């Protein structure tokens, strides 16, 4: 009578409680600084905020009953403590017997595990509160949040293939937009690193939050480029040219991505480099072949930021913003090229 989603959830959390297990309590008490009260405080605060926003209605979302909210919270708290256990049991420090006070006092990790847990609970019930509702309600930076998604996938083999697909999916929403927000902390991370964007070779072939974000951004872009390149029948050595233009846009004109979508910068490069090449392709061909990809939706080429505000079209954005800042680079290929991952 329950959906495959809700049934998997129900069977993941069976026999488990909204509290730390005695195995976790022992790991907490092993640490110099016991994290249990900080962890319970974060959960109570996230708990109150989730049910306050769930209960009250907004134009966007009508508010639902507290009784459904409390159940959704209890299931997410049960997921939280079970997943925290598997993560902590399996950290190399635990396995070498070394104190885990530093790991367990990172507030950002606990808040973003609780929020993914809530996203799992809400997706499984096909909640109308589509991501990123939960991270906006909880004041969680995509740039910091997206890193727990990979851990959760690794730390709970009970998750359905559909759930891992949803979690990979929202990971890809953050890497294509969301983390390129004017208010995102990737801009602060870039500033503390002299505004030096990592290159594909420096991450794919240093280490830190900016590097593994770019790591992840590059490999999403890599996968998406091969797919437009195969659907458009274009070359495989031109492919390395538009990647080098894409890397140039990310490294030397990072601002172009502010309040924008990575696809917008990926397709604009494809047209430029192809037109600079004999391998000319045009936007309708590019847009129709992209229209097939799963994240491709109307808004990404019929609504593009121009000034911050006015919004237009992919071609208006290409000509008004993209060709001035990228034409000088593209003309060189009518030179060094960047290594394409895999």
């Amino acid at each position: 009578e329950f959906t495959q989603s809700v049934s998997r959830l129900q069977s993941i959390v069976a026999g488990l409680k909204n509290a730390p297990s005695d195995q976790l309590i022992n790991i907490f008490e092993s640490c110099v600084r016991n994290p249990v009260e900080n962890i319970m405080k974060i959960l109570k605060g996230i708990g109150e905020t989730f049910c306050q926003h769930y209960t009250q209605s907004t134009d966007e979302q009508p508010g639902s009953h507290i009784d459904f909210a409390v159940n959704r919270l209890k299931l997410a708290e049960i997921l939280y403590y079970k997943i925290l256990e598997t993560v902590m049991v399996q950290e190399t420090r635990r396995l070498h017997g070394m104190d885990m006070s530093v790991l367990l006092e990172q507030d950002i990790f606990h808040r973003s595990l609780m929020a993914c847990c809530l996203e799992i609970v809400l997706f499984a019930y096909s909640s109308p509160r589509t991501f990123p509702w939960i991270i906006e309600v909880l004041n969680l930076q995509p740039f910091y949040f997206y890193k727990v998604i990979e851990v959760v996938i690794r730390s709970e083999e009970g998750l359905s293939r559909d759930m891992v697909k949803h979690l990979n999916s929202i990971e890809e929403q953050i890497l294509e937009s969301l983390a390129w927000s004017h208010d995102s902390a990737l801009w602060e991370a870039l500033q503390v690193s002299a505004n030096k964007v990592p290159t594909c070779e420096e991450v794919i072939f240093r280490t830190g939050s900016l590097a593994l974000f770019y790591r992840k951004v590059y490999h999403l872009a890599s996968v998406r480029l091969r797919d437009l390149c195969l659907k458009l029948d274009v070359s495989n050595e031109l492919r390395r040219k538009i990647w080098t233009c894409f890397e140039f846009t990310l490294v030397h004109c990072p601002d172009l991505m502010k309040d924008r979508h990575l696809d917008q910068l990926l397709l604009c490069a494809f047209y430029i480099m192809a037109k600079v090449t004999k391998e000319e392709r045009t936007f309708q061909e590019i847009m129709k072949s992209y229209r097939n990809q799963p994240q491709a939706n109307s808004h990404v080429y019929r609504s593009v930021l121009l000034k911050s505000e006015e919004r237009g079209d992919l071609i208006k954005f290409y000509n008004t913003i993209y060709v001035g800042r990228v034409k000088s680079f593209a003309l060189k290929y009518d030179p060094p090229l960047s290594p394409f991952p895999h």
Partner: peptide, 10 residues
């Protein structure tokens, strides 16, 4: 110049 005069479908 590098550019396009192509419109798009609705």
């Amino acid at each position: 110049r590098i550019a396009c005069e192509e419109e798009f479908s609705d």
